[PDB]
Design a protein around this ligand. Structure first.
Ligand code: NI
Length: 497
């Protein structure tokens, strides 16, 4: 029958080619890619039924499916696809994070069913990136604004299994099944998203039976509630295997995290196991490295820095950071060891984790100053480089590691900003561009090794934990599957009671 859920914000215009305020989960319900990501890291035919490969690795020819219509009824053509790529590529610099956007030289519709794509070089992540939620998915060209999407679209018309119903009230986004869908019909016919800003209200609405499912891991319900729910059979909860890392990004261009010895010492200071148990209700795993070893090209045997306050103090001592009799905070040339940790003040877990971080770090003679602020000002901080330490997370499959590394080269973003003090930073960036264009496996693995190892050994990050996808479900829904892409929600696989 029908399902109701909630989300902190509306779904946005649903422009397939743009970013915030469009919500990616909603983008992926309405729009579809050429090729679909699978959990084993492979891609299957999707809107593209088959594709050829030149010896070059530079020109690609996709045979498209011939039986697909936009929810309009307008046909999904090679022309329609070519026209989407064009609209995408006219806003090129905005997609610079995603190397594929820079890679595409031309897109040509050869025939109604044949789509030719040429790259400037043999870009190995090609298919995986075509499969992402955005920007390479397809709105009916009829809905462009002035032969463009850059500056807005008309109606959000995709080929996918769900249709966004015309908005009457900002408090609801309603999706209805596409009964003209080319592919398999969802058993569920309607999904209603309540826009509920407050975490506690979303938990109450689930408690009073107004919500069938909450699928998400960005604070969709409070974690203490999640933990209580997991102990109560009135509810069903799940955690997937971990999918992304949560860390601190240390600013290598700002004193005193500009000093390698300080970053190394901070990587020994946090009792991560205790933090997870006490702030996170035991729901995540301890992270020693930027990427979990199960991430592609990331099983590198890097050396963990365990919780070891003694080793940290020694590093600090050796670097000239000494304790004044008997003050607790180290000074170097009379200057105290003071470090700012910025985080979102309305995020109760950022705040709890910050406090524990401050306390662990005080034990090693670092005075960390807590700066909690509204979300949008933390995001400006990330872009501006205005932080000592800031929380940050990776992006999951299939972004990790190649797209997360690719975006590090991009000037106005947290990882780019955090690495600015590194002598290494131009070389790391060079090697990022090189790995992406690689087709030899030995070359590929060794370049990924070098980039990740430099980042680890230069102690750019303070990995904290690996977080999973999280589900809270009315029990009658039974076990919920996980979409292979972290930010998608598998609505189409859900079976009604
Ligand atoms: Ni993003």
């Amino acid at each position: 029958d029908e399902i109701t859920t909630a989300w902190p914000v509306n779904v946005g215009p649903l422009n397939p080619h743009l970013y915030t305020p469009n919500q990616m989960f909603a983008q992926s319900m309405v729009y579809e890619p050429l090729v679909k990501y699978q959990a084993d890291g492979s891609v299957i035919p999707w809107l593209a039924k088959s594709w050829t490969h030149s010896e070059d690795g530079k020109t690609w020819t996709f045979t498209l499916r011939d039986d697909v219509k936009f929810s309009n009824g307008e046909p999904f053509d090679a022309e329609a696809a070519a026209e989407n790529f064009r609209a995408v590529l006219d806003n090129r610099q905005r997609h610079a994070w995603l190397e594929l956007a820079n890679q595409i030289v031309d897109v040509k519709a050869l025939s109604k069913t044949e789509l030719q794509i040429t790259l400037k070089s043999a870009y190995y992540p090609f298919l995986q990136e075509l499969a992402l939620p955005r920007p390479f998915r397809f709105i009916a060209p009829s809905q462009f604004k002035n032969h463009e999407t850059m500056n807005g679209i008309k109606a959000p018309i995709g080929t996918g299994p769900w249709i966004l119903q015309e908005s009457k009230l900002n408090q609801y986004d309603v999706f209805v099944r596409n009964e003209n869908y080319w592919g398999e019909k969802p058993a569920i016919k309607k999904i209603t998203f309540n826009v509920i800003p407050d975490p506690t209200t979303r938990a109450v609405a689930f408690e009073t039976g107004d919500i069938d499912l909450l699928y998400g891991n960005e604070g969709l319900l409070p974690l203490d509630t999640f933990a209580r729910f997991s102990q109560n059979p009135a509810y069903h909860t799940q955690l997937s295997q971990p999918i992304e890392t949560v860390m601190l990004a240390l600013n290598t261009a700002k004193a005193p995290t500009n000093e390698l010895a300080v970053r190394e010492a901070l990587n020994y200071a946090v009792n991560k196991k205790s933090l997870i148990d006490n702030a996170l209700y035991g729901t995540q795993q301890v992270a020693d490295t930027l990427f979990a070893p199960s991430v592609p090209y990331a099983n590198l045997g890097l050396k963990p820095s365990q919780y070891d306050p003694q080793k940290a103090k020694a590093l600090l001592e050796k670097a000239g950071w000494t304790l004044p009799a008997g003050k607790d905070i180290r000074e170097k040339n009379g200057q105290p060891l003071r470090i700012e940790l910025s985080f979102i003040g309305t995020d109760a877990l950022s705040k709890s984790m910050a406090e524990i971080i401050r306390a662990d770090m005080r034990q090693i003679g670092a005075d960390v100053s807590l700066i909690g602020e509204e979300e949008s000002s933390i995001y400006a901080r990330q872009r501006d480089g205005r932080f000592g330490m800031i929380f940050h997370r990776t992006w999951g499959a299939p972004y990790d590691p190649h797209a997360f590394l690719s975006s590090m080269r991009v000037p106005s973003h947290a990882d780019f900003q955090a690495q600015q003090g590194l002598a290494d930073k131009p070389l790391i960036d060079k090697e990022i561009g090189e790995v992406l264009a690689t087709h030899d496996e030995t070359q590929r693995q060794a370049l990924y090794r070098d980039i990740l190892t430099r980042l680890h050994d230069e102690a750019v990050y303070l990995p904290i934990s690996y977080i999973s996808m999280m589900v809270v479900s009315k029990p009658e829904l039974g076990n919920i599957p996980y979409a292979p892409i972290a930010t998608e929600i598998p609505f189409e696989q859900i079976k009604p009671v």
